[model samples]
Target: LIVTQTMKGLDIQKVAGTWYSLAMAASDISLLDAQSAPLRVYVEELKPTPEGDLEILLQKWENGECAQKKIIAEKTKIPAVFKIDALNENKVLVLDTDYKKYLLFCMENSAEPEQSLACQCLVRTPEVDDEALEKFDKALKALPMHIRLSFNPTQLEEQCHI
Candidate 1:
């Protein structure tokens, strides 16, 4: 695993919103290349359960169609980190954010080689300012050498929606 840290002091409410998939890197570069269709990650809803857990509605385009999944994430002792039982207890980390614009997230799983490293960046708008672009580049550079990161030109187009 890389020697990186997750974000802290995150307000769940602040991070709940529509986010465009700006760039992504997976252990397998082919999967990233296969995402030829428009892509977007929408945190459609976050409903609080009585037990203090959150029922999250995560929507994204998979195989050229909109796919939605319901996840039950329990708050962890670490801020911005949640325990997702659905993912075999993998810790989903929300890092690098300015809630209104762009944010970075990861589902860290050091057990499986294919999924051991996963990270993605989201933005409110497809276009980012020069400073934001620089930040994204820096974050990408920090990733492990084996991990392949790339951007989707289609994602930058207006047609890549919903």
Candidate 2:
């Protein structure tokens, strides 16, 4: 019941661009740990490849510096589905997105004891309105995850160089 399908007819082109991490929930310490930076990460951009794959550019703060990394994911036959192996994540799905406002996506690792699931909420801007918040809440509950941390991407917005 935890693993859900991606959105139907997802337009990857529209999802490409800067997205802020407003909130995240993880089944384990793989993410949103106590010492984790509030402004930990962002999907700086999603570059769609000619082969219909995606090159994910990630920007984050680590130790004491801003870091950048790129990972690649191949789109599955099911247009919205993707497979990725990064930071222990094995699969990724676009749970939902509105193109103009907010998005909800999930990543997971099939571990021994149980599945390590992590879901993230993204916004065009750091700030979000009530409607966005409501959707975020409803999405997580159905996924059986809770918010481990809520962030104010403003700090991440300030000086993280590309």
The lDDT per prediction is 0.60, 0.69
Q: In model 1, where is the ten-residue run with the lowest total lDDT?
A: 31-40
Expressed as tens digits, the lDDT of each residue in 2-88 for candidate 1 is 526666667676766566666666544443444342223444445656545656776656666667778787887766777777535
Task: Provide the lDDT at 78 for model 2.
Answer: 72
- Alpha carbon lDDT of residue 152, candidate 2? 62
- Root-mean-square deviation per candidate: 4.2, 3.3
- For residues 27-80, could you state the per-residue lDDT of candidate 2 as single tens digits? 666455544444245666778787778788877667667678787888888777
Q: Give the TM-score (vs. native) of candidate 2.
A: 0.81
